[PDB]
Structures are given as C-alpha cells and as structure tokens.
Symmetry: D2
C-alpha cells in the first residue's frame, strides 16, 4: 500500500490500472469533488448547517419548486450564519456557495391518494373545475395546450414516472407529470421563474440551476433575466429531457455549466440509457472545460437508512471516475433522517475515487483534445499541471480574482489540489463548481507594493496548505501569478518550496 | 448510429465517452449473464417461465435459509419451467442451477420466539438459555468463540450492517455493548465482526450437507461464501469429490482477507463473485468499488468468470422502477468487465421480480454497446502471454477476425465449454454461439460473458465431418431464429481437427446461408 | 530476433533495447531487385546473384536493344531454372522491365562515345537543338534531344546534366539556342541525362519507343513493369492499355521521380499495382534534402494501401568501386526496411559495378537485421487501425491469421494461393513470421517478391484427384520447404491458410497446426 | 508549414503519410553541425564561410598534426569566429573540440575486435586545456574507467571541458550504460565501429546509443561518412541524404563531417547540405509521440529546474511558441529544456562564453552571448538579457513582434535556481 492509488497510477494499461487498485492504499486526502446538498426541513437549522459544512458541504442548493421567497430567504440567512461562524480564522474558513434551482416548466396534478388499476380508464381533464376533485377517472393537469402537444398512442408519466398512461399504481395529489417525446410549448422562464431569478440576484446567489433547458435560447433567456446586476452568477443548465440531450452542444456553449438531472431525465428517456447521457455530458464538459454536476438519487436509500446500498456507493464513485466536477444530494439532505451521514458518505467515496482516477490517460487525452491557443494563461495552466505531475507537487497555488486562471488549471485535472487565493468572496464560493479547486478567501488588505501584496497571498496559501495537511515545510508547490494587477494576465508559473 | 459504433471508433477514451449516443439502438444479443436468486416471489413454475423469457440465465438458491425439501421443490420448479421450452432446441435457452452456501455465518437468536434504541445498552451473551429468549437487553449469537476474537470497543454490526454496536465491556460468555446505530432488531439476524478474525471453518458441517445435496441435485455451480484463502477453495473442491468434480466453484469474496489473498483464491477457483453485501460491511463501504474493479480486472486478465452481486437494483424490491444509482451500478458493472450480474432480494422476495430481470437485461445490453472495444481488446491481448495452445491462438484470431468483419457471431463447437471460454476471454463484440451436446456445459456457459449456449439434441452422424457440419448449421439456424444475424452476413466458425476435447484449431469466416 | 525490443511499451525504449548481439531469423522478408548489366549478365554470375539473395532482375530499357535484352532475359530464366531440380529449395526470380520514359539526353562529344570535355565553372556553354551538332558537342556547344527545350525553360533556369552533377544557368534564351553559364562543372561525356526541374516537360509518358518496349515485355512474358516518370494517373492508364488484354496480369509499378508525381501521388497509387521511390531523378527534380520526406510519405501511403513499395537508387552506391559500403549507405538500407519498404533495389551496384555479388549480400544482411528491429507492436496496431472494415472473408481471415501468428510466435504463415491475393492480404498486415505462399502458377510465384514477407514456393507435384488431398499435399510441401530452409522444425507451431473450395477468392480457413 | 499537419496525426503511420515536401521548414536549425577542420578549411576566409553556412563546432583531429599546427587552426577558427563579434545580435558562438588519437595502431590503420590515455593522449589533452577547448572527443572508450582516466588528466583546470566518449568497438557498446553515466555525452564513431562489428549492425548500435542518450538527457553525436561522396563531388548520394535525415529523426543532437570538411573538395557544400537536411528532418519528427515517451520514461523529480523545464516544453507546444528563452549561466537549465525536445528553438542567453560554445552539443539550443554590462537592479538585468533574446529571434527570423514565447528565469541570482516560467508576447 503506497498512497493515493499511486501504484495503479503507474500502470501502462487501464486494465492493469484496475487490477492494482488497493483498498489498503489510503487517500492522501484533499477531496477534489464538490458536494452540493439540497436544504430542507432536515437541514434548515443553523446548527445542522454547521455540521453539514464540517462534514463537507461546499454548495447549498435551494429548490424553488417549493417554498416561498421568505422561506428561502431564511434558508440563505441560515446558510450564511452557519458559514460565517467559521470566518474568525481565514486559514481554515471554507466558502459555501448558494445555488438557486428554478422550478421551470413543471406539470402538476390536482388534490383529493387513489388506486389506479392497470388497463383502467382515466379522463385527463385540463379543466380548472375539477382542480380539487380528482378521483380514479378524472385527473386534472395545469398545462395550457396539453391537447395540442400530445399525440395519440404516446405515453404520460405521473408522480415521477410511477404511473404510465398502462403501468400505474397509487396516484397521489399534486404529483408531477412527465410527457416524453417533447412538444412542450411552456416558456423557458415562466412568470414564477422570472420572480425567482430576480429574487436570486437580490439575494446575491452564486449560481442558478435552470430546470428543463431544452435549447440554447433558453439559457440566453435565463441570462437576460439575471441582467447586469447578476451577470457574474454562473448559470448551470439542467439537462432533463431528450431535447436537452440532443441539443447539448449549443446548450453547453451558452451555459456556464451543466447538471445531469438524472431524476427527470430517467423519466423522459429510457432509464437504461441514463448512464449513456451522463457519461456523454460529463465527457463533453470535461472536453470544453466547463463544470458538470451529477445529481439525483446518488444515495437515495440514505433518506431512511444510515448506510447506502452497494449500488449507491458505486454510483457516487463512478460519477467521480467519469469526471464530474460536483456530486449532489437532494432528499438525502433536504428531508432524510441521515443528512450528515449522506454528506460524509459522499465525501469518503469521492476521496477514494479521486485517487483511483487513471490520471496518466486522462491528462494525455485532455491535452490531445484541447486545441492550441494563444491565451498565455491557457499555456501557463498546462505547464503548471505538467510541472505538478513532474515533481509530485503538494498543490498548485493560483492567484485569481474572477476564478478563470484556477478554472483553466482544473480543466486539465491535476492530482494536486488547486489552492485558489482570491479577495473576491463570490469567486471563492463559485470555485466549488470546478473539480480540485480549494478556494481560500484572503481578507488581508491590499498592500502598497504590488509584489509584496502578491507575496502575501502566496504565503496565505502556504499557511493554508500547511494547516490543512496538504504539504509541509520544504515541499514543492506550483505557484501561478500574473505580470500586473487585474484579471486576465496570469502568465507566470513558479516551482517554489513552501516556507 | 447503431450499436454505439461511432463511439467504438474513437481515438481516445474521452472522445469515446463524448460519442455515447442514447439514440443508437443496442445489438440484440445480450452478453452479460443474469443470475436471479429464486425465492417465495419467484419459485413458481409460472413465474420462473417468465423469468426465463425475461432473460434469466442462472437460478441461484441461497442456502442461508430454507430446508432441503424446500430447495428440492424449487430446483424441480426451475427444471419444469426450463424444460417447458425443450421441444424446440433452436429456441431452447439453457438455465443453470447455482447453490449458494451459508458459509461461516454468525446468526442471532429469536426475539421471544424487538426494537433497539439508539445509544442504549445491549448485552450480547453466549448463554444458550437466551437463545429462544432475545429482548432489547440480552442478545444471543451462535458464534461461541466470540470474545476470543473481539476486543475493546470493537465495532460489531447486526442486521445486514444496519444496527451497529460497540463492545463497551467484555466477558467470557457475555459481552456488554453500547448501541452506536439504533434500529429495529429482529430474529436470526446476521452479525459481522469487521477488523477481527473469525475462526469458523471454511466448510461447516451444514455446508457439507448442502454440498452433498447439491451434488445429488445435479447443480452446475457452487457459490462458496466467505472464501479467505486458497485452502478454502481446495476444501470445497475435495468435499465435492469425484461426483462433483465438474461442478464449477465460484469463490465469494466478502471480507478483507479474501481481498488481500485474492490472487491465490482466484488461481484455485473456477470463478469469483464480488459479494458486495457482506464486503460492504467487512471493509469500509466507500472502498467496495475499488475491490470490485480490482477483482473484475484481475478476473478478466486471467480469463475467469466474475460476478457482480447484491443490491444492484435493491429499490425494485418495492418499486417497479429502479433508482438512477441502481441504473448506473448495473451499467458500470458491465463496463467494468463483469461476466454476470446478480439479483438477490429483487427476485427472491421482492414485489417485481420480472421487472428486475428485464431492467438488468435492458441496461446490460446498452452497456455492452458502450464498451470501448478498441482499448479493451488491445489491453487484454498485450496482458495475455504468448501461448503454445492452438486453441488460444485460434480464439484470439477468431476475435480479431470478428472485429475485422463485424461478425454476426462466433460459432464455437465445444464439449466442455473451454474453447468457448477461451474466446470470451478476449471479449468480442459479436455473440459467441457455443454449440454442445453436453447439457451441463450449456448451463455452465452462462458464467462467461458473451457465450450463448445452444444444446444440440440431434443424433451423432455416421461421418464425423457431417456431425461437425450438422452442429455448425444448428448454430446458423439458431442465430437466424434469434435475430442475431441474417442470411448473407459473415460469421466466424471455430471447430477442431479431430473429435474429443482440446483440439480446436480451425477458424473459418463463413457466410450465413 | 530483437524480441526484447519488441515487448517494449514505447518506441523510445524499443530503440534502447536494440541489441547487436540478438541474431535475426533466417527468412529475409524484404525483396531485393537487382538491375542486370554487363557485370551481371552471364548465366554464371546470375546463378550467384540468386544464391546471394536476388529475387527480381531489373532490365533498364533506357539503353540496349530488344535482342540484347531478350538474351539477358534468357540468361536470367536459365540461371533460375538451373535450380529447378529441387522444388524444395527452388527460389523463383521475377523479371522487371524498366521503361526508358521521357528521357532527355545529350549528343556525342566530338564524334566519340567515350570522349569527354572539362567544363570549368563560370564559363559559357551553348545549348542547341539543331541536329547538325548532335555528334559534335564540345565545351562550347551542347546538343540535346528535347526539341521543345526552349519553350519550357525561361531565363535564369537551371539545367542539370549527367545525374545532376553538372549545373547550367540559362543566361540568354533563343528560338533554337540556349546560352548558359556553368555553375558546377566537371567532365562532360556523351549522351548524358538531362534534368529540367520546375519545367513542364511535354514529352509523352508512353513514347513510341516505350510502346514497343512494353509490347516486347508482353511478348517476353515479363512479370512487372517499372514505368519511368509517371506524372498523373492517366499515365498509368496509357501503360495499362498498351499492355492490353494479353498483358493484363503484368503488374505496373509507377516510378515517382518528379515533383508532379509526388503531388499527384494519391491518384497514381490508386491506378497502379505498385510504387517505386526512384530517388535518383527525384533527388534532382526536387531538392535533395526533401527526398527522405517523399520516401517516407510514399512508403507509408503504400503500406496504408497494401500495395508494393520499392526503395531504389544509390542505396550502396560506393560499392560500385569498393567491396564494402559506407556508414551512410548501411544506414540507408536498414532505414528503408524500417520505413516499411517492400523491396530494396540495386542499380549500378549490380549493373556495372566491380562487386555486384557483395552488394546483393550486403543488402540481404542489413535487411534481415532491420526486419527484426521493426516495432511490430505499433506497426500492426497502426495498420489495423487505419485499414477499413471488410466484407471479404479472405481479409478477415488474413488479419486473424496474422494476429494468431503473433500470439503463438509461429514459424510461418502457410498460404495456399493461385493469384497471390491471399498472400498479399497477409503481408499487408506485416507479420513477423515469413509467409510461405504455395502456388502452382509460375507468374504469381515470381510476382510474390513484390510483397514484404512472402516467400513464394512453386509446387511441381501434379494436381491430385481428391481436392482435399491436393490441399494437404501443397500444405505439407510448405512444411518441407520451411524445415529445409530452417524457417522452423518439427514440433514448431505454424499458421496454415486454405480455402473451402478450389479456385481463387475462397481463402477463409485458418488452422493452427504443429510442424509434422 | 514545418510539417504541422503531420504533427497532428493520431498514428505514426499517418504521420509518415502526411509528410509534405511542399511544407517549408522554419529557419531555425536545431541540430548542431560539427566539421573536422583540415587542409581544405584551415584558412581564415573559408572558416568565415563555414560559419556562415552553419558550422557550430570545429573538430580538430589529433590523430595527426602537431601542436603548433593545431594552435594555428584554433587561432584561425577564433579569428573567423570573432570577425562577427562586432554585432552580438547576429554573433554565433563557435565551439572548439579536440578529438584524441587514442589507442590507434598504425603505416595504415589496423583494427582487431592497450591504455586509455597514453603519453601522447595526455600531452594533447593538456594542450587542449591550455588552448581552452570546449570539449574533448575521447577516442576509443571501452569502459567507464577510461572516462575517469581521461577526466583525471584534464584536471580541475579543465574541469568544465565536456568529456564525450566515442564508442568505437564491441566492448564500448556492451558497456555503454556505465560509459554513458560517466560521460558528458556520446559520439557514435561509426567509422571504427563499422569495422569492429558487422556493418549490417551499425544502425542497431546507432539507434541504441541515440535512444539511451535521449533517455538520459545527454548529448549524442552521429559521426563519420554521412556525406562521404561529397569529398570529391558537389552533391551527395541518396543514401547520404537519407542518412543525415535519419540520424536527426533518431534523436541525434549533432551531426558530424570529417573528410568532407577536412580535406574534401566541397567543404562549404557539405556544410550547407547538412544544414538543409537537418531542418527538414526536424519538422518531420513525431513530437506527439516523442514528447510523451520522453516523459513516460523520465522519472519524477524534486528539482525545481527539471519541473520548470518540462512545464515550459509542454507550454511551448500548447501555444506553438516562437522560442523558449532560457537565462542560464552554466547552460544546465537550457540542457534540461532540450532534453524534452521542444519544437521551438531554445534561445539560451548567457554571459559565460564557454557556456555559449558548449550549448551546441544539445539539440535545439541557440546560444547567444550577451555583451551588455551587468545592471545594478537584478530584475532590470534579467529583463535586459530577456530583451537581448527577443532582438535575436527577430533579427535571425525565429519569430516576430506579437508572437508568443516561453521565458525561463529564476528567483535569485546564481546558478541552479531556474524555476520561473513566463508566457509573454514578443515586443
Ligand atoms: O483568474 P483571473 O481572473 O485572470 O485573475 C488573475 C489575476 O490575479 C493576479 O495574479 C493579481 O491580481 P490582483 O492583484 O488584482 O488581485 C493577476 O496577475 C492576474 O491577472
Ligand atoms: O472446448 P472443447 O471441450 O475442447 O471441445 C472442442 C472440441 O469439439 C470439436 O469441435 C468436436 O469434437 P466432438 O465431435 O467430439 O464433439 C473438436 O474438434 C474439439 O476438440
Ligand atoms: O489467393 P487466391 O488466388 O484467391 O486463391 C486461394 C485459393 O487456393 C485454394 O486454397 C486452393 O485452390 P486450388 O485448389 O484451385 O489451387 C483455395 O481454397 C483458395 O480459394
Ligand atoms: O542554468 P544555470 O547555470 O543553473 O543558471 C540559471 C540562473 O540564471 C539566473 O536566471 C540568473 O543568472 P545571473 O546570476 O547571471 O543573474 C538564475 O535565476 C538561475 O539560477
Ligand atoms: O453473500 C452475498 O451475496 C453478499 O454478501 O453480498
Ligand atoms: O530511375 C530510377 O531508378 C531513379 O531515377 O532512381
Ligand atoms: K438476448
């Protein structure tokens, strides 16, 4: 047992790399995959959120499919209270990002659970009269132009795909309806969505998970609503249907990142094909260097049990091996009985899978597919990661203001952690979207001599790395800086020993 | 689109991932075998027939529970459902019977004939007076030498890993434990002692009766629970003796010692099962995927069957649709290189045994198309040594030829299955149609990825050349009827130069007549 | 056989593992083409050329008459049939006809064929097309046979005479005259070759002289044609039509010796049966520092296409006058084989040199060494990666047999073939083991030398009545050939390729059998 | 352009198929040219033409000749070299190499498959240290003891003189690993090597020694008979052209000319041909495979200079940089960059004149001798030397204003602290 699966990292083939995986080779830590947890009744309290952060929650997700604005406002206030409870020591302080998940073009049912028999008959009524008198033969939908977008012989899936219209069971109240095959004329940004996004920018959110993004214009519509006041809010496009998968290329280019929303995608396309769409979207985002999130049902059984299933354990690890920048928890942290155990489990799995990555092939294929550029920062990023592998550096220290220089380093997936020193608090929170970036917010005021002010932030990362066990005095690290203040000038790579 | 063949011709693994297409329909022939545990929800002849039609290849009997009378009837029901299709040998699908041994299990007593509290006090005693009298305060387990294996504050898990304890005080015939993770206790629950060394024998006195029962019931394979060393496999082999010398022994690796000594266990085994259920308790659950990918790769390297098992579609016990994690697990096990995937409670006792079998079938077929054959075939060859066996050279030549012509199938005539096993080791994309007159060979063929066994019941022809061609034409008709290929396509045919095992040396690229 | 360097994971350490103490196998896979001339024309010398390793005899039709060439062909066929007493060790020898082509030659120096003049650099020289000076050239006026030499060369052009050794600068141009200034001088002889780089030489690709030479080749039953100065694919079609129906099985080798032939190489190779990198004229028509680029480009493209490629000209040039080559020439032989050249050639080394046999032996020695040094692991992988999927059962059987040959490290791949296609499809994937190609067609046994690794063997036994017994006779004939020539011994594992019915195009059966 | 289409091929076979004779190479020739100086090129005026035609190292064959004669050849070499010193932007350093006579039994030349440095070798070696030669071609080196024997003879006075051993027999090939570890480089002396071992095996030992030297990051010279026919002819043979190109493709840092420049009839033509072929073959190398295989076999390091070097080569491929500018005092930092064989030329700025002359032994290093005085502010003195390299690349046509280049410097003055890589445009 060497460490960090380094015996397997030196295998000439991927098959031999698999054979040399050792359960007794413990991970030289620094977890390089971000953990996003949806907040709900089980995790809304300040004391709970403090434990979630200590257990490894890097992004708090707000699902605007439910709850009011004042409800989500207290959640945000609770998240910032729990996060700022560690701000007394900036060396150990961990930024925590806030994410708004839009409701999007949803389709619900009416009120009163009944019992749907297989082969029975139910008259789907887009009639506001029976909006509360739903039985076993008269179901109501809130979709305008449902009769136009549907064709005879097609299928309809109510309550997260449980009932099929066919295979149906106990139909509840106000359950979601999925209409695969697509034709949904519902707007990309609804009236509720517009007010939610305007609420998000008012609340200084860090990122937006846009639901049911079908085409590239949907992301432009979302970015237009965020306006100039929220122009720095990263837009993560959720791919949840067939149209989003086919139009993924134009969606990826218009978006800041992608979430593989496997829950709705598992209903819109055959569930046996979800792994295809996941490994495809993760590969293309890794190719383009944009964040990708694997979400939904990763540790589903932990909603009721303190330990996950074997399938759930492998799913989290395989999402990391796929190359996902972040993993997500929904009901496991929003409503389950073991939110802290779900967060801790994803942290332990991610750390093991990060060591089991075949870096030798990944780094070669990432450069082989990346184009030649004239951006000096991009060339500095490859040279830094190449140097980091060459000397087994304890970290790559990147001074960045917008996060860009750190993102360009993370695109090439170094094994060493990326310590991104920034004075921009939003940049530090947003850095969690990119694999391997450990953001550190330096609150020290700006010095007069610019060379000394850069030396300050470098030494800040040194103490942070020594305090968190990333390296020790005398170790080699890679330091990325630029030639003048302001963003966009990162061009200097140094190999320096830590003091 | 078709077959993920645009992704199959990528220069890098990353580009291969980028070219994965949900709109490219899969092959047709599912290569990864499906093993289903037969239990109350599936042991009926009517259900078993639909299990076979849904894709079940191996019927696994878990001897951790049930009597020999109960298992004999289940086996009888499996063969009644299987022989229900024996009238048309062209469409007849062999179905193997697997015996899963109890092994060195540690079980608890019977609750009165409860519900533990989180952080309470649980006294674990060996006094047999509390065996049929278990309460929330006194707990009896059948591992007599328990205190001579556990120490201070040792973690001890009950109820398939759910309830967790901590030996707060020791004793000689009792143990005082403080609950670390509460939960509703039960009767006759399994107990794991991770980080300790149980001294129970590899083959218990009960396993002797079940292994002898398996021989007289003509089972095709034994799943030996809790193998730790090569000598455990030899013990199972010696116990089976001459009457069970052809029964294949699958070593179930479910603890730290089995993983540590996997190489010697694999060398002595006929195959391996990644029994993730117990393994996820004996070692940290976040490390299971490492042990699975290690054992699958090593078994692929050695050309030996590997089974990924336990909790693959666990939520389907109660729901007609699996979770996304379960959808990825089945797909990733196939992509890892597993010859077989298994279902336990999903088929033995769950509410949707047929939906679980169908889901594994659909996922496995999709995953098989998504395999990066350009890298896999290249890496399996560079790692396999140069050989003098003509069958090995013919097998890899047949696989290379099947990739070159995009063959509809690789037809293999075999008595023992070996020649077909040697083809599957190189993982062709095309299905391997192994024609045989040995019914046991046809059932045992399901252990190897891609082998579609067909049982030839035609009488032996007078001229050997005619008997060979009769069996080749049987595979032709089978592939045509099963939709594997059509007339005009090219298939590879593997025969030998003389009758008897061990002479396969002839590879022919023939058109489908 | 450099087996340690063959198991390396990288090309670099494969080079580091190259061992001068690891001996090669017996079978030399690279064909040797020997140009026959005054030093190699006799039946006695030709016998030793075959014993030294000659597989193809080249006849350069730029000089000589039909009767002189017919007697050379007769002496060749006599020297090879001298060994027809033992069909086990009988090595076939092909005959190749190198066309004259659109050549530009000067007149005679002072009415003599042997006289020479010394051109001093910087002086002047008049080039005229008036036939009155065709036999009266000197250091002042030079005659050449290209009539349109003025309507193709402008002022400042550079003319090269005698293998590009003499260079002229076209100072002033005339209607039928050409005023030049000598750049590089020296001895100017009679009837020397003239190269006009960068000029559109409008000479016919198939002149009337070549038309009769090709008709002579058809009548003399030549195996292949080396077509000089192929500029486009239509030039290969003209050669194809002249050979007509009677010369249909005569393989056409397009000689790339100009800038246009390199630029239009794709359409030429697709219309050709083979390619020769004729570096002599190529080194003059294009800069000499670019010849290796054209050589590696053409060798790789024909390796990718599965068509024969030949490395020619000045490979052991110093051996014309000396019994041992230079280090550069020894390096050029091995690098040609390492490049992937199906055959290496000798021109003046065997045509007129003082050591024709030593050059043949030197080429055979270096080829055997470079064959073992080939990175088969990367070559076979890259050849399969770039070859398309096929619906032909023979091609799938060929790559399967080669793949099986690497798995067992077989002594050989025995291939029964009538037209040679079966053996060519095996050689296309470059197995390490020799390809013993059994045939009853004498022409295919001669044309098989054009493909690397094919050891052609002509069976003399009569066709047995039972076809399955006639196959085993030919199969066991190759076993005798392999055991005799030391390619393998009893107990060794070999690959044997047969078909399912007589006639060409049915090879589909691969058998892994031990040597009886 | 410089076979850029062939460089982007996914396979080595497709890389050959893409080699285009119509894709012109860059003006920067990375392979050093060593010319043996003799009667045909001893004059001051031709030595100027030899330099103008691309000569980088002047080899003095001590198998014959006296010290008063070889010192006059050196003086003329330094005379012709310093004739261009009136312009440090275009000045090219020219190295001086002493090839020892060694155990040479003679009155022709006898070979048969003896001391390392006998009395004649020591006197000539001491004359080399007195004449301030940059390197010594130790003739016939059979074991590492011979290299130590020679290194002890040069002493601490010539401790910086680079000992590069000439492998000339079967023993040196078998004991090559211990010889290479004790040497500063290797010359594959193909002349004597072709006699001691079968001629058909010379290419085996050549590619063996070049690959191992490439692996170890030590210079290797391919020597002798590369253009032999040019001794009496103005154009080489096709085999000689392919030999020059294949040596460069093998990975040889320098190519050599012996009789072609020493006594041949076309000295300048032989130097020009080696120049033209070298740059054509440099564009034809499969950098995609070479860079990967060089790193796969290079071990993990803890030296900041080695990590900065491979990071700079990786960055230079990423931006297709015009050059890798490396400030170096001993040349070592430029040597570590050249070990990973970048496509871009390595402009090694130095003030040490010997470091500049010795840099010709390493592929891709273009040494420039900075004559400007040291500045008080060290940061300004660094930018001055960086600006010197920028003006050199523009004047010599290696790149133009606006092009991207990699600049390697260190964090403090003194040798051994190169650790800073900057990606900067050309002003
Ligand atoms: O990642 P970004 O947005 O390009 O920021 C990197 C910037 O940080 C710096 O290192 C220092 O910038 P500041 O001093 O303004 O914070 C610059 O050299 C560089 O341009
Ligand atoms: O895989 P196995 O057990 O070695 O069997 C393959 C055998 O089957 C055959 O194809 C047919 O032999 P039989 O006629 O005895 O069935 C033999 O040529 C070959 O040896
Ligand atoms: O290579 P070719 O010209 O297609 O011929 C190969 C043929 O040789 C054979 O092995 C024997 O054919 P013959 O008996 O007619 O000579 C056939 O089975 C096969 O089709
Ligand atoms: O390559 P070398 O010989 O180690 O020298 C490189 C050195 O040059 C420097 O750039 C400065 O050189 P100077 O001492 O001449 O100013 C150092 O930073 C570095 O250590
Ligand atoms: O026995 C089993 O199958 C297990 O533990 O997973
Ligand atoms: O014709 C030839 O062979 C040549 O030019 O090399
Ligand atoms: K199937």
């Amino acid at each position: 047992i060497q460490t960090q699966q380094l015996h397997a990292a030196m295998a000439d083939t991927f098959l031999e790399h698999m054979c040399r995986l050792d359960i007794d080779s413990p991970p030289i830590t620094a977890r390089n995959t971000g953990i996003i947890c949806t907040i709900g009744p089980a995790s809304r309290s300040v004391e709970t959120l403090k434990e979630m952060i200590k257990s490894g929650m890097n992004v708090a997700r707000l699902n605007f499919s439910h709850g009011t604005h004042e409800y989500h406002a207290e959640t945000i206030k609770n998240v910032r209270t729990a996060t700022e409870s560690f701000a007394s020591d900036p060396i150990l302080y961990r930024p925590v990002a806030v994410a708004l998940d839009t409701k999007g073009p949803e389709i619900r049912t009416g009120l009163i659970e009944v019992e749907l028999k297989k082969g029975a008959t139910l008259k789907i009524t887009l009639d506001n009269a029976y909006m509360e008198k739903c039985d076993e033969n008269i179901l109501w939908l809130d979709y305008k132009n449902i009769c136009k977008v549907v064709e005879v012989g097609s299928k309809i899936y109510v309550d997260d795909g449980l009932i099929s219209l066919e295979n149906g069971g106990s139909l509840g109240s106000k359950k979601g309806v999925n209409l695969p095959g697509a034709a949904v004329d519902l707007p990309a940004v609804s009236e509720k969505d517009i007010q939610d996004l305007k609420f998000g920018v008012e609340q200084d959110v860090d990122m937006v998970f846009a639901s049911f993004i079908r085409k590239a214009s949907d992301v432009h519509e979302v970015r237009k609503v965020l306006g100039e006041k929220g122009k720095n809010i990263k837009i993560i496009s959720k791919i949840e249907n067939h149209e989003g998968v086919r139009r993924f290329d134009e969606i990826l280019e218009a978006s800041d990142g992608i979430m593989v929303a496997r829950g709705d995608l598992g209903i819109e396309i055959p569930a046996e094909k979800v792994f295809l769409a996941q490994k495809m979207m993760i590969g293309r985002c890794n190719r383009a260097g944009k964040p990708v999130i694997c979400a939904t049902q990763m540790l589903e059984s932990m909603i009721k049990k303190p330990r996950p299933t074997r399938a759930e354990g492998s799913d989290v690890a395989n999402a990391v091996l796929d190359g996902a920048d972040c993993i997500m928890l929904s009901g496991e942290t929003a409503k389950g009985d073991y939110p802290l155990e779900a967060v801790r489990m994803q942290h332990l799995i991610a750390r093991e899978a990060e060591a089991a990555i075949y870096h030798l092939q990944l780094f070669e294929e990432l450069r082989r597919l990346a184009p030649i550029t004239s951006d000096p920062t991009e060339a500095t990023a490859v040279g830094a990661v190449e140097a980091s592998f060459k000397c087994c550096s304890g970290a790559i220290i990147v001074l960045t203001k917008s996060g860009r220089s750190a993102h360009q380093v993370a695109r090439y997936r170094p094994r060493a952690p990326i310590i991104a020193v920034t004075r921009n608090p939003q940049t530090a929170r947003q850095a969690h979207l990119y694999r391997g970036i450990f953001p550190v917010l330096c609150k020290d005021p700006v010095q007069e001599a610019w060379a000394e002010d850069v030396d300050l932030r470098v030494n800040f990362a040194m103490n942070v790395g020594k305090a968190r066990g990333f390296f020790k005095k005398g170790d080699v690290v890679i330091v990325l800086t630029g030639w003048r203040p302001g963003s966009g000038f990162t061009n200097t790579m140094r190999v320096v020993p830590v003091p």
